[PDB]
Design a protein around this ligand. Sequence first.
Ligand code: CLA
Ligand code: CLA
Ligand code: CLA
Ligand code: CLA
Ligand code: CLA
Ligand code: CLA
Ligand code: CLA
Ligand code: CLA
Ligand SMILES: CCCCCCCCCCCCCCCC(=O)OC[C@H](COP(=O)(O)OC[C@@H](O)CO)OC(=O)CCCCCCCCCCCCCCC
Ligand SMILES: CC1=C(/C=C/C(C)=C\C=C\C(C)=C\C=C\C=C(C)\C=C/C=C(C)/C=C/C2=C(C)CCCC2(C)C)C(C)(C)CCC1
Ligand code: SF4
Ligand code: SF4
Ligand code: SF4
Lengths: 38, 743, 80, 155, 136, 138, 97
Amino acid sequence: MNLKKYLSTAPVVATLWLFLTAGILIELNRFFPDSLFY
Amino acid sequence: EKQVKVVVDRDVVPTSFEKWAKPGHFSRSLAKGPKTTTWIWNLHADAHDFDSHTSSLEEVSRKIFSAHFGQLAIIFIWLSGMYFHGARFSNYVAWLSNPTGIKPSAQVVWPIVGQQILNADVGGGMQGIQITSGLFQLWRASGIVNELQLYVTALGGLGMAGLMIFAGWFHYHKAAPKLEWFQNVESMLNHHLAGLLGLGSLSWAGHQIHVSLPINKLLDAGVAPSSIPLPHEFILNRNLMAELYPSFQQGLVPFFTLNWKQYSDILTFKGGLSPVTGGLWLTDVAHHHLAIAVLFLVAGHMYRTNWGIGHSIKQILEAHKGPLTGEGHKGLYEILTTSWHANLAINLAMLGSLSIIVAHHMYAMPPYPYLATDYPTQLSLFTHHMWIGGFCIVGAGAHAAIYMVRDYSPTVNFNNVLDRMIRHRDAIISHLNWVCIFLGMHSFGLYIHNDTMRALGRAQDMFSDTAIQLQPVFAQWIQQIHTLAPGNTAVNALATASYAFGADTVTVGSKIAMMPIKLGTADFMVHHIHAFTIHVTTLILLKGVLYARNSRLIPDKANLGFRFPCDGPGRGGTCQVSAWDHVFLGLFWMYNALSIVIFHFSWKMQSDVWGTVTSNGAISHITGGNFAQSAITINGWLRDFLWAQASQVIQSYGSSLSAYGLMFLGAHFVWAFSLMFLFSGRGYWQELIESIVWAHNKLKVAPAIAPRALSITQGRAVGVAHYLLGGIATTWAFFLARIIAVG
Amino acid sequence: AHTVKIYDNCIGCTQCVRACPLDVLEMVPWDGCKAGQMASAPRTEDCVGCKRCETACPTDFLSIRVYLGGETTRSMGLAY
Amino acid sequence: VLTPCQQSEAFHKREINEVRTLENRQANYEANSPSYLALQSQIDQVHKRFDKYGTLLCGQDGLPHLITDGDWRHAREFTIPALLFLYITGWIGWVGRSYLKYTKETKNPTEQEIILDVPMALKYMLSGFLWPLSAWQEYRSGQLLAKEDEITVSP
Amino acid sequence: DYIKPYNNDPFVGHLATPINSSSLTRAYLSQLPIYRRGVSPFLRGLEIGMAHGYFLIGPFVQLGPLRNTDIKYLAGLLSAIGLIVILTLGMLLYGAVSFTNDSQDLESVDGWRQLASGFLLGAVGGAGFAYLLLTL
Amino acid sequence: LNLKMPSPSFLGSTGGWLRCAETEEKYAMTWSSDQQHIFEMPTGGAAVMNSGDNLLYLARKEQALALATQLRTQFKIQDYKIYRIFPSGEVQYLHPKDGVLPYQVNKGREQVGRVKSTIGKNVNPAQVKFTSKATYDR
Amino acid sequence: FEVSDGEPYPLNPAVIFIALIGWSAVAAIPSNIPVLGGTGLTQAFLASIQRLLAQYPTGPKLDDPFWFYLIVYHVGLFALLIFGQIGYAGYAKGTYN
Ligand code: CLA
Ligand code: CLA
Ligand code: CLA
Ligand code: CLA
Ligand code: CLA
Ligand code: CLA
Ligand code: CLA
Ligand code: CLA
Ligand SMILES: CCCCCCCCCCCCCCCC(=O)OC[C@H](COP(=O)(O)OC[C@@H](O)CO)OC(=O)CCCCCCCCCCCCCCC
Ligand SMILES: CC1=C(/C=C/C(C)=C\C=C\C(C)=C\C=C\C=C(C)\C=C/C=C(C)/C=C/C2=C(C)CCCC2(C)C)C(C)(C)CCC1
Ligand code: SF4
Ligand code: SF4
Ligand code: SF4
């Protein structure tokens, strides 16, 4: 019953990391919309 | 006599996450470590192939029963999602108040990157994406009037999904049936015929009689949805049902006294569409479900199970034998009880054919209320079921080839229909190929000839109504017979089954619901084109299944397997020789055939059926009679249909339909990206990957998992997947945008 | 009329002969490996170029190379 | 020729056109009800966006044009985002390279590549915040570039 | 049981099915201008041509581009004659390359030449007869 | 050899040798068995091998060899002989040609098609241009 | 007659006669329906045949009832003929089920 190892596999870790990245991007886009030319 | 008993193994498989951390554990080769990037693809390619994992039929049967439960749970979750979306983010009540004016919608897009524009002004207060799934019409036909019922249904669906999750886990780790179970085809058929379908239709008929009928009757009588009594009130207080239907005054006594004719208020056979909503009369639908339930229940007592009475499928199969078929159907029973691939092939072909039939019957005889008036929903449903049916048919052929390559046995298939067919497979395929050539010439050549004539100014020499005429006399004759059936061959039927055969037109909300679909020369040519494409795709699939084991080019294709790239650059070239490749080609042909079929339905419906009706009966279609003279030439099919109707999907930018336009472009990209994988080989990509790997080596950043190009078979699969995805998405966005912008 | 050539790196594993579907290869005595056997192609007239032997060769670089040259009835695998 | 959008009539015309497009749909709804507030927020965002973009340069079409020639006056347009992108992606590349170099030291690097070692992966991800400095010293020590690699016939 | 190997010897690439081989089928396939015993190549060609041109004229006269004009029959006859000439050309080419010098038995250059001449003459005569029937 | 040898009980099929085999090469396979086994014919179908001597005709050498492979694998039958018959009527012994399986090393076999050293020593195509020599030729 | 190669095939004209008589008698049952006009399909079909024979050059068009009678009569007659030959050869002649 090694759930940590499974959660550490490539698909799970990749989906979690990309989900966090997309969430950060979206959150930044609603708090700071239509960002251009810094 | 064999006892139809249940035997199961307890705690056969332990429940633990130990195997979750070892990808590829189900395969001996995949459990030794990747060593290359091809292992990642092989892990998913052979994940659901339970027959390759183990050689025991019991284990495969258990892995199927479970995972069937998982897919059932997935379907229940999807259904719960649809119901919850309807209850929380949809204008269902507003639509009920004004079904013709309010556009169905159950999706609300978040305002983040300007996507808030997709929230179309569908009406009813809320603004969102217009749904063409027919969820609103189905819910109305089911008697739903308030969103509380939708919420309760969503919760029930979630609970059912949880049950289908527990059942799937329990039937694999707590109680796994033995191979004797799953081989009781007589019992499984009896139960599915009398319990899954018979009792199911019976229960639905009861619900319609006690919920759909009264609620819909009150809705069609001008009563507000909030003022209609609750469904349980119609059951508790019989006075209400008696008032709406006097037949209920007699109660169930007439049923038990065989005085079924007293149920003429609830069990009618009017035959036509309701003039108020445009759909089938709910009474005729309830009577239909009752008859189908009684017929299925009677049919469910045919096979013999744990009692002397019944029938044996093996005895019936072996009994059918003739001079032209030596052993007849001998050995087929053992084939369908020892190989899941054969059963899957038969079931997939039948399920796909059933879906196609469903599409035709649903558009011609709109069953749900206000379904015909909602052309977007009609187009989407016909096209959707047509596509799912075609995909299931191609899958049926693929699984037939799989069984032929892996589960075939010469002893079992000895002098029987299957063996006798494999013996003369050359006659079958050459004659079928000849039929395909004849059909293509006499179908596409007519179109090409018309193009050449119109371009030369020789319109008098065309295959049209004005010029040489090719009238579907047989189909037109069947239509006339159907038109006259309600009085000479259907004595108790009060109207034709479908107004598409004849009779009169039906208009609901100043919109045409169903009018006679007259067939002409254009329909003659298009129908022949459909037959030609169906013949070529079935030829490809049949060829792949008949030669799956061997051929005059490769004498031992079976030993090579069902899914192998090729035998090499020998014998002139043996590329795409395996049955899997035949399925790969059949996918493109099925896509072509289905695309042409949906194109004909869309254009014909928008030019001769769908449209508006002005006071006094004047009819004005979306494309006034242009299909009669424009569908007879390829130029017309490109100008009056692909170019004229695409203006809605290309000009959708800046409005709520912009998304569709975007998807219209994206799909194209995908369809064009597939070409990359279809016109190329892995040798070149492997060399390019070698150079890229050298670049990585120069920086000490090379990966342990040696990068490799996609396998030949994997490359073909990716190419076909992208091709179908892009094409179907392009025609999906085009159909939806065209039908939503106008009509 | 394909040309099958065996090179000195052959280890005499016989996998090429076992995987050949036209009886084009065989094993002959040799002294270049402990196996004491080497692959031979004395019936190249029946070869079709399927390259099953090339795929079944374990050496780093195939010790058996099949070159597609003259095409005949046998090489085209024509049963008609 | 290019002129500031704040002084270009096309920019104001586009702003008014967008406001009109939103107001046309806003009029159908009621002041205090679902929707109508959703369109007012959009109008306010449009005003803020145009006021923000007024500093950019645009031609006759009124669309903001970005100058990438490297002029300091337009550093915020491309120079600053360019440097920030290079920093983020250099960080991604350097942490990935270090993780690969560590995994190659294990018994079965393939297993580490498939099942990522979250502890060490995070150890290398958290670090590298000074990747431009770490890229150097690895190059100077000769630990960055290799000497001999796989090469086919005719090198 | 009706389906058997063609020559009662298995391993042959053919099957003796009902319409493939039968009393009626064997009688019909036989006695035709071709496959009939005691018929010179020229006679076989003459019969085949007179039977081919007759039905070949039909399509051109009925659906030819000039089917509505007063010379529909003449135009169709000319088209059929041209098609017959092209077919005769094909026949002669086939005989020139496929067959060599040997006895005239329909499988030689002279035999196929006689067959082609007979086919051309018969086809032209049949087309003319059909045209005459249509005109009358 | 032994053209009168009994044949397996087959019901025809449309995948057998065509006319080309009559005017050209036609392979034959003769094997002996002790049980009436059912085997899949290489042409497509199922046949019963007569207990004793079995002789059948095919249009390709690969088909006969594939049938022999399945007779040796699906059944423990190793006494399979493949001959070749020409239109003239002269038979030719093809498989195994020596009474020993090809993958089994046997004395008396002469190495054919041997190249010295590895393929990396092959000459460039430019060095054997305009000549009747190949790269693999030393 | 030989159906295939040297294997004989039993042909009996009585099969055709019995199939024709049986189907005509079955279809001769009257039915008070508008298409049949209160008479069996056999009588209606024969009547339509006579009507169309009067005008020998002009054939029946798409709206003529003759086609419905023709299809149903031929469907049933062909079914009796096919099933009749199956029963005669399979059971009477010993060809077996
Ligand atoms: C699986 C499908 C299904 C299901 C679950 C149900 C379920 C139900 N149906 Mg129903 N129904 C169905 C299909 C179904 N039906 C179909 C296909 C039909 C034919 C179209 C009907 C027609 C029907 C009618 C007409 C009625 C129901 C009624 C009912 C409800 C009570 C039945 C009852 O026991 O009353 C029993 C009623 C009797 C009359 C018993 C018969 C014998 C008695 C004992 C006679 C002896 C005399 C005695 C003094 C009673 C006088 C009664 C007289 C005044 C009528 C029940 C919830 C009843 C209802 O509750 O209405 C809302 C009702 O009246 N159903
Ligand atoms: C269509 C008419 C018809 C039908 C249904 C049958 C049916 C039957 N015959 Mg029979 N027969 C017929 C005409 C028919 N016969 C005629 C005209 C003759 C005179 C030559 C004979 C002479 C004959 C002999 C000598 C014998 C039979 C025997 C039999 C039985 C043996 C099994 C069999 O034949 O297959 C059919 C079996 C079934 C159970 C029927 C299944 C039907 C399927 C499910 C649907 C059919 C739909 C059909 C195509 C509809 C057509 C349109 C309609 C308007 C007519 C069987 C029940 C044998 C017997 O007596 O039994 C031992 C036998 O000895 N028949
Ligand atoms: C994965 C990256 C990510 C990140 C970095 C953030 C960051 C942030 N979110 Mg956010 N969010 C995310 C994903 C993320 N979110 C997702 C996937 C959803 C669901 C679509 C939401 C929905 C959401 C809402 C409704 C709100 C925020 C808010 C906020 C800000 C509040 C302050 C804070 O520090 O809380 C840190 C928050 C997180 C790190 C994410 C936790 C999200 C949890 C699951 C709460 C959402 C509950 C949801 C309504 C119901 C069940 C969801 C299910 C997944 C369990 C913030 C900086 C609040 C805000 O607007 O600030 C004014 C706020 O109202 N988020
Ligand atoms: C009248 C009894 C009955 C009923 C109603 C069903 C119904 C069903 N069976 Mg089933 N089956 C039965 C008896 C029955 N079976 C028997 C006796 C056998 C042994 C001979 C089998 C062996 C069998 C196999 C091997 C498989 C099925 C499968 C299925 C499902 C088909 C998928 C589908 O169409 O979605 C329709 C789904 C629904 C309409 C939802 C209804 C679900 C509820 C729970 C009704 C099912 C009741 C269940 C059979 C018994 C309850 C047991 C109790 C201890 C809780 C379906 C739900 C397939 C499947 O999907 O696997 C899970 C499949 O693989 N059955
Ligand atoms: C009830 C339907 C059904 C079922 C139960 C099966 C079951 C099976 N199939 Mg089959 N098949 C079906 C329908 C079905 N199929 C249909 C409709 C087709 C025609 C398309 C096929 C064509 C087919 C082929 C050609 C093959 C199988 C194979 C198999 C077996 C292994 C599957 C596997 O492991 O691959 C793993 C599955 C995947 C890796 C997923 C692939 C994803 C594709 C591209 C679909 C993407 C859909 C999605 C909507 C895309 C948009 C979203 C995107 C942007 C992310 C398995 C027993 C294989 C086999 O027998 O093994 C030798 C085999 O080669 N199937
Ligand atoms: C739409 C058609 C199409 C497209 C888009 C491409 C694209 C590409 N081809 Mg190409 N090709 C095509 C058709 C196409 N080809 C055809 C018909 C042929 C003839 C057989 C070729 C033959 C060919 C050869 C021989 C070569 C290429 C190469 C390349 C790559 C060049 C480098 C590059 O620009 O990378 C940039 C990347 C892109 C343009 C793709 C866009 C980025 C994607 C969309 C982002 C990732 C996915 C995204 C997250 C969304 C999916 C999410 C998921 C959940 C579904 C590139 C990816 C060359 C190469 O390998 O370059 C090194 C190469 O040598 N092609
Ligand atoms: C450790 C991750 C890593 C690193 C440091 C590099 C570094 C490099 N790559 Mg490479 N690449 C990677 C992953 C990586 N790549 C992967 C996963 C793929 C498959 C999609 C490729 C495919 C690829 C190609 C086709 C090419 C390069 C090339 C190059 C070189 C030039 C820049 C470039 O074009 O990048 C391009 C980057 C991509 C195309 C996609 C990168 C994929 C993701 C977004 C980044 C990797 C994330 C990784 C999983 C993080 C691990 C973190 C760890 C702590 C757990 C450069 C030295 C080029 C070259 O040959 O040198 C001149 C070249 O043509 N790469
Ligand atoms: C494959 C589809 C097709 C079809 C059905 C037609 C049909 C026709 N074309 Mg057309 N055409 C086509 C494709 C087609 N075309 C294409 C693709 C082009 C562009 C290249 C053209 C360009 C073209 C031109 C320029 C013209 C026509 C014309 C015509 C008409 C007369 C042609 C003629 O005399 O031929 C002669 C036919 C034959 C000599 C024999 C036909 C074969 C026979 C009937 C088959 C019998 C088989 C039999 C049943 C087997 C069993 C018998 C055995 C057992 C005894 C005719 C109706 C002419 C016209 O004016 O239009 C009205 C004309 O001028 N076409
Ligand atoms: C001729 C009257 C039928 C009208 C034609 C359309 C019928 C639809 C059924 C399709 C199969 C054709 C019927 C003959 C077939 C038929 O029923 O024969 C009879 C025979 C069945 O009788 P048996 O004695 O074998 O019965 C024992 C077993 O059937 C046990 O159930 O079938 C065959 O063995 C041959 C199968 C196909 C033979 C090759 C024909 C292929 C042509 C396909 C195209 C058909 C015409 C296309 C439409 C124009
Ligand atoms: C598929 C079909 C069919 C068909 C049939 C037929 C086709 C028949 C016939 C026929 C034909 C197709 C015929 C033809 C003909 C021709 C003729 C009868 C002629 C003649 C004569 C003459 C007059 C001649 C002359 C001449 C001259 C002038 C000189 C030169 C030489 C000659 C001799 C040529 C049937 C019904 C079976 C069945 C169903 C359908
Ligand atoms: S490498 Fe590709 S093209 Fe060549 S034989 Fe194999 S599958 Fe065919
Ligand atoms: S290419 Fe094929 S036939 Fe030729 S020697 Fe190699 S394995 Fe044998
Ligand atoms: S050629 Fe390859 S497979 Fe054959 S013996 Fe030599 S090393 Fe083994």
